[PDB]
Design a protein around this ligand. Structure first.
Ligand SMILES: N=C(N)NCC[C@H](O)[C@H](N)C(=O)O
Length: 332
């Protein structure tokens, strides 16, 4: 038994999906261009039927922390070396796989980016950046990426975070945890459902981690003057989760909130588990049910580092209307 739902492509299905992505790469100039953003969800209807059935059903299941699709071929020679930075990471070798991720994502919802993250790209990059080993962002390595809800600070955070493993030669684990419902007593649960916590945007939204835009103003407002929010929402028997293990804090001087958050931290630490995304594996993490992170690892810096493409997905773009930063697909 596993806490995520898993699908493995047959070689023929994987080949068909790859061919569709390659065709898109031939026909559109970029993945984040207006044209492909609009067309991808309909082109995705041509993906292998068994995969479409999996995506449609698994998303409606009550339990999974992620939807995992194994078996997409990746040829390291065609892919080329791991980029040294996200800025130069739209390499020709990675381009078809970026289209593939977008097509899969279009089966689950509306893709979007952030004006304040990797230049507002929709398909973003996860890779280790030399000098940035001990940071709190996804280009870290030697320091573990602590568990968190993606963009916890924001009402407009993704419903799903998609990850496509381009290479992962040393098998570094992604970490996941759900709400620790088997261990949270009722009183603690009660407190976590109340608006008694603070966050802050994570460091990926800092100007220094981009190559402004007015949207950085909103990040500052969120960091300097966070509004108290709940950590748990929805059904008490299956709550949605909004927390960042590093940045969450209790409301000022609220020791009962603090106790609940401390207990939560301990229970999530104790229940955190590993998912290894091997080369060609794709995961869609349910960002309402689960926190995620990434284990510490020693970076290589030899051209073959671990490298993922990544994408934020919402079930409803209109929920972030307020934050539509000039365009509906880049938020802030
Ligand atoms: N490090 C913590 N706890 N949170 C922020 C990490 C996030 O995954 C951020 N969006 C990033 O990609 O680096």
């Amino acid at each position: 038994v596993r806490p995520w739902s898993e699908f493995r492509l047959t070689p023929a299905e994987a080949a068909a999906a790859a061919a569709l992505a390659a065709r898109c790469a031939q026909r559109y100039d970029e993945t984040d261009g207006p044209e492909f953003l609009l067309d991808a969800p309909v082109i995705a209807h041509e993906l292998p039927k068994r995969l479409r059935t999996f995506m449609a059903r698994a998303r409606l299941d009550a339990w999974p922390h992620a939807l995992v699709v194994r078996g997409n071929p990746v040829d390291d020679a065609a892919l080329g070396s791991t980029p040294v930075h996200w800025r130069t990471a739209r390499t020709p070798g990675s381009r078809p796989l970026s289209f593939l991720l977008m097509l899969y994502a279009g089966l689950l919802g509306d893709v979007f980016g952030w004006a304040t993250q990797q230049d507002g790209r929709v398909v973003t990059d996860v890779l280790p950046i030399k000098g940035g080993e001990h940071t709190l962002v996804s280009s870290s390595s030697r320091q573990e990426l602590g568990w968190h809800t993606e963009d916890a600070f924001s009402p407009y955070r993704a419903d799903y975070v998609g990850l496509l493993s381009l290479r992962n030669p040393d098998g570094v684990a992604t970490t996941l945890a759900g709400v620790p419902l088997d261990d949270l007593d009722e009183r603690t649960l009660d407190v976590l459902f109340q608006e008694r916590f603070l966050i802050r945007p994570d460091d990926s939204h800092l100007q220094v981690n981009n190559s402004g835009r007015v949207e950085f103003e909103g990040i500052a407002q969120a960091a300097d003057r966070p509004e108290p929010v709940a950590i748990l929402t929805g059904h008490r028997a299956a709550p949605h989760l909004r927390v960042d293990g590093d940045f969450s804090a209790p409301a000022e001087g609220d020791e009962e909130a603090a106790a609940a958050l401390g207990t939560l931290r301990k229970l999530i630490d104790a229940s955190l588990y590993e998912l290894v995304l091997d080369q060609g594996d794709v995961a869609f993490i349910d960002n309402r049910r689960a926190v995620h992170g990434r284990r510490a690892f020693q970076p290589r810096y030899d051209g073959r580092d671990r490298w993922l493409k990544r994408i934020n997905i919402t079930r409803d773009l209109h929920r972030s209307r307020k934050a539509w930063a000039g365009d509906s697909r880049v938020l802030g």
